[PDB]
Structures are given as structure tokens and as C-alpha cells.
Amino acid sequence: PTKLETFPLDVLVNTAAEDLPRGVDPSRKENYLSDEDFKAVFGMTRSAFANLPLWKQQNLKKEKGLF
């Protein structure tokens, strides 16, 4: 599929739900971070993060303003 559009970390964290770009799945904001931002925010690979239980992915994101 087409490579996902990336958005700055500050935009994904600080945008009202109603104003979120239509192409962003609000439950998977991490997928729209650049690889650099994902690494800075989570400190692990995308696949390692995806292997954590869903509730743990969400809980980590909540504190980080991404869920």
C-alpha cells in the first residue's frame, strides 16, 4: 500500500479529535510518526511495540499524549 503520510509528533499529540487529519487512524497514531519520532518516543522497534498487548500499547501512548 501507499506509504503512510507522516505528521510531526506535536501535531499528532496536540490536535483536537474533530480536527485530526482524515487519513490518520486515531487508535494508531504511532503509525503516522516518522521513524525518527517513533524511535524517540517509544525507544523500541515498531514490531516490538506491536508485540506488546494492545492495552499496554495504549497505556504507554496515554501518558505520551498519543491515545
Curated annotation (Swiss-Prot):
Phosphorylated on tyrosine residues. The unphosphorylated form increases the initial rate of actin-nucleating activity, whereas the tyrosine-phosphorylated form inhibits actin-nucleating activity, enhances actin-bundling activity and enhances actin-severing activity by reducing high Ca(2+) requirements. The tyrosine-phosphorylated form does not regulate actin-capping activity. It comes from the Eukaryota. Residues 1-67 are annotated as: Headpiece. Consists of a large core fragment in the N-terminal portion and a small headpiece (HP) in the C-terminal portion. The core fragment is necessary for both actin-nucleating and -severing activities, whereas the HP binds F-actin strongly in both the presence and absence of calcium and is necessary in actin-bundling activity. The Gelsolin-like 1 repeat is necessary for the actin-capping activity. The entire core fragment is necessary for the actin-severing activity. Residues 61-64 are annotated as: Absolutely required for activity. This is Villin-1. It comes from Gallus gallus. Specifically expressed in epithelial cells. Component of brush border microvilli. Epithelial cell-specific Ca(2+)-regulated actin-modifying protein that modulates the reorganization of microvillar actin filaments. Plays a role in the actin nucleation, actin filament bundle assembly, actin filament capping and severing. Binds phosphatidylinositol 4,5-bisphosphate (PIP2) and lysophosphatidic acid (LPA); binds LPA with higher affinity than PIP2. Binding to LPA increases its phosphorylation by SRC and inhibits all actin-modifying activities. Binding to PIP2 inhibits actin-capping and -severing activities but enhances actin-bundling activity. It is found in: Cytoplasm, Cytoskeleton; Cell projection, Microvillus; Cell projection, Lamellipodium; Cell projection, Ruffle. Monomer. Homodimer. Associates with F-actin; the association with F-actin is inhibited by tropomyosin. Residues 1-67 form the HP domain. Belongs to the villin/gelsolin family.
